[PDB]
Design a protein around this ligand. Sequence first.
Ligand SMILES: [Mg+2]
Ligand SMILES: [Mg+2]
Lengths: 257, 257
Amino acid sequence: HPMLNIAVRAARKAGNLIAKNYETPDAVEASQKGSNDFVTNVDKAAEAVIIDTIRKSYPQHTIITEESGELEGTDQDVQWVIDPLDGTTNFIKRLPHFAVSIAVRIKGRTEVAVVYDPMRNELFTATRGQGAQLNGYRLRGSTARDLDGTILATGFPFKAKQYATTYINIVGKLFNECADFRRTGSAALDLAYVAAGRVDGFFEIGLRPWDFAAGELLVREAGGIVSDFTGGHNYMLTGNIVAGNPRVVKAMLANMR
Amino acid sequence: HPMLNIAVRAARKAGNLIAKNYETPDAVEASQKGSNDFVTNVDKAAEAVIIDTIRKSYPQHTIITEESGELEGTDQDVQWVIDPLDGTTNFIKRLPHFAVSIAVRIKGRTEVAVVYDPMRNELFTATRGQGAQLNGYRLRGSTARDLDGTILATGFPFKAKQYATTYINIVGKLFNECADFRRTGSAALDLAYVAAGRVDGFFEIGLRPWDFAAGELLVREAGGIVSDFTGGHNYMLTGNIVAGNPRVVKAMLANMR
Ligand SMILES: [Mg+2]
Ligand SMILES: [Mg+2]
């Protein structure tokens, strides 16, 4: 795919910049969008690289990014949904777990996806109908058949703490069944880890379209399922995400019911 | 220090073996000690390398490991406390976050400590009175002065689920004050991340002496504090650990009170 090629180039170019800013934390300094949500010059500098790169082969495509909103082009049938740095808190604390997320949707259907870990040099790619890969290895997800002994990735609603006590409950009910959780601070990498089988499932409240647009396709092409907290497909409206293989999502949702 | 030198060699040698078994997951297969606690041939194979290495320069020292218990020597004034692979669940799932933990105690006082991430090639070292380093960079911990906006590492009691509901409460009370948590699956690396400032604090219930013997010294020589859940120093008996800089541990314990 020609569009997959461009996405990997922009992801790798932006990943190279983010990495170098990590090993040389000379000029990084933050800025507060919301309570406990931050922006850095490295976010916008890597965002500029992604836009620039996309726009030498397709600057007529609409580009939707977290930091600049919708920047529509002439061809509105194709839309790049970009997260320049998923895991900004981790980056500021110099916790080396973050990634570049790039998704392409064609008239409302995601065709390609890229999640790139610059610190580990791990490249997750997906193409619709053509499977999902990690550095050239096809991903099949987790062979888990129930919630017994499962490791579940998740995130806390530090952007929507009005649902704090609701989230705490859901964790305990799941903890009553599952073995452990993982809280990594990167939703894109959490979804990539579900598709790779490094964890068994994922759930978070109120994600943002660019947080999961690429990661959702990784899970689906690894044989997985994505849904909202009530089993429906209206998570593009809500940002309430449940992801995993069919039985786990099944068992996860039954526990949630 | 001559003993620090040997500890790094055994950590790196065992780390090299664990790494190679990760990139070539040919022969790994697990075994169940307790519910949701596993052993692999790679644990004991790396444990054998550590014992062998320690025992070419000091086989008269007592060695305490998770998988073999106490193997006492003639000189019982010095004791190596070894975790060959902290993060075994992560290793089986091929989640690349684990480490080798090696601590040396001399008549009951920890003199040296090593935590080695083989996947990231990150070497955390500490020597009593001589500071803590990461790949030759001295660590000072987190400059956080309260719990506002803090990232706290923690673990779930999947080995002692009788305290599940007590742990869930404590998380919610802390979540009422702090921004987010991190759940990585490696207590040794969590403690190393507290000393490096990648996270701001740590708390877990019922850890095991080799889980934290090396990591505790990393925090202390980074200017940090370790205590039990009631502010005392009787955590060698309990395994209930709170770690961070003095104000955070202070603020963490006040929230816990
Ligand atoms: Mg972002
Ligand atoms: Mg271990």
